[PDB]
Symmetry: none
Subunit: 105 residues, 6 copies
Amino acid sequence: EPTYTLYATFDNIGGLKARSPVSIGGVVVGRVADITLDPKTYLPRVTLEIEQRYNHIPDTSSLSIRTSGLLGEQYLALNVGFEDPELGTAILKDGDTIQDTKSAM
Amino acid sequence: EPTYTLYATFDNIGGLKARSPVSIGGVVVGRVADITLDPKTYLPRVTLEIEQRYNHIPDTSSLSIRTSGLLGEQYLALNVGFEDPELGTAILKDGDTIQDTKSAM
Amino acid sequence: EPTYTLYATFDNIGGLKARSPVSIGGVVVGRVADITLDPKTYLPRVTLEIEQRYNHIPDTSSLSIRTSGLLGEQYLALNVGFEDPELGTAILKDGDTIQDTKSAM
Amino acid sequence: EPTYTLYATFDNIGGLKARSPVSIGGVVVGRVADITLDPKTYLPRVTLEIEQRYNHIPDTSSLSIRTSGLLGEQYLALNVGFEDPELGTAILKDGDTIQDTKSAM
Amino acid sequence: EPTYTLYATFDNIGGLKARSPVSIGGVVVGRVADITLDPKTYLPRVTLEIEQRYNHIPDTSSLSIRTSGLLGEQYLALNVGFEDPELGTAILKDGDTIQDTKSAM
Amino acid sequence: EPTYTLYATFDNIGGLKARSPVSIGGVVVGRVADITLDPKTYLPRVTLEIEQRYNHIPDTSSLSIRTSGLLGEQYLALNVGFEDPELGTAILKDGDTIQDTKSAM
């Protein structure tokens, strides 16, 4: 499965770990590859590997830390954004950063 | 049990998976066969297998994602729709799509 | 241990199953024998087996789907009805239907 | 341990069973000896065995079905009543009935 | 650990038992040794064993029955009382009673 | 893996114990080394061991007792404080005390 890399900074990653799934409408599209806490900014940075066939995600898209049911595992929900194509059509590409992140409750 | 195939699009399938039950007032009438995320719409599409003896379901029928108790598994609740007697018998058959769906939580 | 059979329609049986107990004020008096979908109404049809020593239950009696504590098993509570004696001797017998039912919400 | 017998009728005994404890301020003083559903009145009747040393319980005392924590066992809580001794000092004795009972929620 | 003995009367001890912990802000400082129901008052009396190194507890101190999380065990929370510096050092010793108690839930 | 030690006072440590993790935005940076009762205040005194690579934490930083999901483990969230740089270089070192703490309620 070919993949591309995205990065995202959160204030709080909760119980998120390496190989946590990334999902759109509940379907897994990717994985967390790495979590490192930046020693300078003390903000956790997440590296994701997204399957190449999910390739048209607007850069206004957001990432959320969520839980499966009441007592299941943490995952990242990627919320596919809107961008008016009449005003430029910025798409997340290999090596891009998702700016809009929502941390563990 | 011989089965027929129905399709349904949701915004979010939650923790629904292959072999999740489909029920009418809590009685199992079929199974989720397959879940795929369409790369064109980024909306999940579900393939269901419904037992052929439940073969007079009106096309007005709807599907809901629900949970068993507070803690338990996700399933699809099929809500049997109104059939106008004045204008004949518009019935789900192998390969039809249920238009009316409601997503997780 | 001789039993008589009664029938009941629910909108929704929740997690009720074959061999779920039937109780009067919390004492087991019977079992669910069978659950199917009625092909005419697509409503769940429950078959119950009641011990023959509990044989003077008024047909005004009702059934409720209930749960043991929080997160325990589903069961049927049979609520023994009031009978106006000036219309009396209206008693549930083998094959009768309990009209007044309350489903799982 | 010498015991005396008390009886109590409830509308609903919930998950109460033979050998369920009877307690005052959470300390076990007794046991359920028997539960029978009266085939005439369809009200559950409980027979208790109370340790003889707990012998001065006013007959205005009440019995409650309660649960240990959120998900533990059912028990009977005996709430020790008031009786003005200047107006007669009726005490529960061997073979007496507790009139004031509170059923499972 | 050498211990000293304290007593305490509650209305209701809930699911407290022998070996239930006694704590100060969540740190274990002793154990429940014994629970007896006094047949004269029908109020539970608790015998506690407190570690001798916690030996300057003011007699104004109170005890609470509490639960660990939503699901877990009952324990006694000892709330360290105010000591008036103007009127000397009124301190719990072996065999003393804590007057100020608060019962289950 | 070299660590430095910090100290912290709580009113109530809940179910926090030795080896409970310390986290910054959900990433483990350390461990609780020890919990005792301070003999002077009878308040819980917590010893923490933080990995030496996380060595520029402002002393305005706070600690909170938190739980993983609903009914999971207690841990300490270290909240990295704002520092007015015109009073800067006020940095937590081996042996320092975190003043700003939030207990289990």
